[model samples]
Every structure is written in C-alpha cells, then in structure tokens.
Target: LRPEPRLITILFSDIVGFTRMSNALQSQGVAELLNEYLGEMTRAVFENQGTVDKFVGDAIMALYGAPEEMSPSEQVRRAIATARQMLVALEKLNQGWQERGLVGVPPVRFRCGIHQGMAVVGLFGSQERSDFTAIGPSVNIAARLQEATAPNSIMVSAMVAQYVPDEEIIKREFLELKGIDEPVMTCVINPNM
Candidate 1:
C-alpha cells in the first residue's frame, strides 16, 4: 500500500444518553433512532469536507484533510463548523421527537475531541479490499480527548487549539487527561465557556 505524510485533524463524537435510551425503548426502535441520527450527522460531516472513518456503536470518528490537502488551520475551522452544525441538527431532531410524543428521549448531545498532528496515511489491507487510514499516537490521543469531554461540550488539545482562531476558543481549566502524562490546557468552543 502507498504511504504519505500529511497534516490532518481527527474528530470523535458520540451520542450522549444512548444507554438510557436503549433501556427505555424497544431494541428495534432504538436501532432505528440511532440509524437516523448517524445518517444526519454523517451528512453534516461530509458537507464540511470530512471523511467518515467509521462508526463505533453510537459513536462516530471522522477525519479532515485526508486524501487531500486542507491546511491545518482550515481543518481546525472545519471541525468547529461541523460541531456547530451538528448541534443545530440535533435541535431539529429533538423537535421532531417532541412532536411525535417521544419527549422522554433525552435531547441528543455530542462530545467532540479534536487533535492535529502528522500521521502516516495510506491505503491498507488486501489489494481487492483496501481502505485509507491513518495510524499514530495522534489518533489515540484524539479519541481519549473525546472520551474526556462531557455531554454538549467540545474539548480540544492545546496543539489543536493553536490552529483554530483565538476568537473561536474560550479558555477552560487545565485538565490531566488519563493515560497521558502531563496536564493539557484546553479550550471549549461553546458560548458559555
């Protein structure tokens, strides 16, 4: 498989309250709701020039600047934009649910983690069924950061924060991320932050 060096932004997002939803709804109904949520979020990601990396249960991983050259700053901007769009879409979804008398469903919220770093990206797997992917510490860190975030929040590493415009970020308290040495100074992109 061919390999190349590139700067990319990785984002991981998961549906909040998914377990509680599953417990409250029938299995088939839960699956249908998740499918619809994924479909809408995936569309928003693609619209912002991102690639759907994969789906993990109720979570999604997406990549920007893959198989193409989007500058580091642009990638950061795209990630923020996508998150905002997803929040708006979620509001619409909740509205629909309320109309259908499914108000017990917790309003959907997303926790996003983003990181920017160099990675070895290329096509891998057997020639007949290969796929493009990136591998490195960066990916793992991004995933961890996403997990560290609370519902309805976006937490980004200092490295990733640097690429985003200052006006877009509001400083939050420093946090020591689990499994990673040293504390990370992070910022949240929400208005209340």
Candidate 2:
C-alpha cells in the first residue's frame, strides 16, 4: 500500500501574465524564462527547508512540514515566510531584468496561495512514470486560492490564516472561488501596502 501523509501546509504560486508572455515570446522563450525563474524560486524554497512538489508551466507548487512532522502552526508560519521571501526575491529579480533593459517587455509578477489541511502524499502511478505529489482538498483549495489572488499578492485561506496569529496577517473579506460553492474567508500579507 502507498504511504499517506498526514495533514500539513500546501503552497501554490503562479506567475501572472504567463499566458500573455507565451503568446508574445513564443513557447520556446517562455520555457526558457520559466526555467530561469523556477531555478531561483526553487533555491529559495530549499533554503527555507521546504520541498518542491512540482512545477507547472510558470507556476510552482511546494509543501512545508512534509516528509517530516511539524506542528500545523509551524507549517503555516513557514508557508507565510516562504511567500514573503519569494516576493522579495521576485522583486529583486525584476529589478535586475529592468536594469538590463527588459522591463517594458513582458514584466512578470508572482501570485501565491496557501492552505493547511489533510493530504495524501506519495509517489503515485505506474512504474514508468510515478512521481511525488500531494492530493486532496487542501491542494485543491490552495490552487483555487492562487487563482483568486491578483498579481503581486499573497492570498491564504482561512484554514491557514487561523494558524498565523502574528500581527502581520491582515484579514480581508471573504471571496467566492469558482469551484467552491461557499465564500472562503481569506487574508493578505501585504507588508509593502
């Protein structure tokens, strides 16, 4: 039987304007740029003691407090810290590109979403193509939350928000996600605003 992971925190980050960038720069250039972006982002994730679950196009899916046990609160805290660090890294990356005369043409921003709940984590599929992944409602909610977030913003579900008691977490109005029927409460960690 496959091993099932207990509850933990999940993070999803999607690069805004990715589709538009693909259209403007073609698939080849888009892939190259995404590689560069993911390289830097993944490095940050590892530095923060998180694992890279997968990379989907211009989006990054990661997990914290996994393959090991950690308190739910600690998982949430790390998730928030990871999001903030990613934003700072992205800003610095953009500035570097801007200085290199790449600002006006297809600038990018990272929109992130985070949630904490039970998930089944394991390598699933046939022997030829099995890969490590997390499945269940928690991951689904995180993806939906990412879609709900605007460019340059970090939005987290109430489940995750509850774990973050720090004054830095700013509560916001509930949002109606596309799939989920009920409006899910969310918060934004906008240190700059």
Candidate 3:
C-alpha cells in the first residue's frame, strides 16, 4: 500500500554515563543492571498504552498514538505521564541503591525526548531481518532533542509542549540539534514531588 502514515509521539531515552558504568561493572554486571532498568522502563510504556519501537544500546525508542489512533492532545498528555512514571521509578531505584549500600553510582537516571507528528511506519528490509519502525523528521528530532536534554530529565518538542501546560516545564530553550537546521523548541519537565 501507499506508505502508511500515522501521527504518533516518539520518545527516546538513554541511561546516562553508560560507558563509564559499563567499564566499572563487568559484562555480567552490565547485563543484570540493564535488564533490571529496561524492564521497569518497558513497564512504564505499557502502563501508558504506548508501543515499544526498539532499543539502541542503552537507549529506548517508544511510541504513542501508534498502530491505533488517539487524539493528538491525549497522546501527548499520556506520553508526559509516562515520562513522569519513568522518573518516579528512577527515584525509587535510587532510594533502594542507598539502602542496600550497593556499589557504583545510583541504579537509575536517563534523558528522554518526545515529539508528535506524522511518520511512515512499516517493515524496512528483508523478511529475514526486517522490522516495523517509523521514519520522518519527527523521529529524527525526537532523538536530537534527547541529546540536548540534561541527564535524568524529559524534554519535549514544541509540537508536544503545547499539549503540556507551562507549569510542568522546568525550563525551555532553543536546542541546535544535529541534522536539524534551526534550533528546536524543547522543554525539560520539572521534577514531580
């Protein structure tokens, strides 16, 4: 069929300081920690009714308003709630880390970005190795927005921020993300008490 297009929200999140943490913890430790972290992250998405797009190294790409349609505003709001869930879960992990007297830094912290727009979603290659994923400027910008975000924070594109009231935004700024010609209007979410 003609390239299937859908309006969706993209989220990209990468655990911070992964390289240093990887070296500090050996291969086995890396697997155990990541498994625990990704498991909780996946849970947050499911709770929001979002689909998991894929995982890149320590980064996770997830989608909202995909496969099925949801109102633009509803999708954006749910995505924001998911981000908050991830942050809340991380805070709990941090608390556990301190209580157990574990080694290494804290067990959780990540940078995330969200964008809403139209994208083509379909399988991309040979049947033997192909997979379903979305591709468009919306996807690219979401990834770049993550690069501009501070550790343990959630950043949203202008397309998404409008659905979120200013009270929830911790900060707003122009981010010159790679591959994007102009600065992106992105906002960092304020920490929830």
Ranking by lDDT: 3, 2, 1
The local distance difference test score of each candidate is 0.68, 0.72, 0.73
lDDT of 1 by residue, 1-193 (tens): 2657667777666778788777776777677777776776677678778766676666766677776768888777776666666666666766765565443567767677776667666676788987776566566656666777787676666767886667767665567776667676666666231
TM-score, structure 1 vs. true: 0.85
Tell me how far candidate 3 lies from the true structure as C-alpha RMSD in angstroms: 2.1
Per-candidate clashes come to 0, 0, 0
State model 2's lDDT: 0.72
Candidate 1 — worst ten consecutive residues by lDDT sum?
184-193
Residue pairs with backbone atoms closer than 3 Å in model 2 (clashes):
none
Q: How high is the lDDT of residue 24 in model 3?
A: 71
- What RMSD does each model have against the real structure? 2.6, 2.3, 2.1
TM-score of each: 0.85, 0.88, 0.90
Instruction: State which candidate has the highest TM-score.
Output: 3
Candidate 2 residue-wise lDDT, 110-193, digit = tens: 777877778886666888987676788777777777777877677788888887654666656588876767787767656242
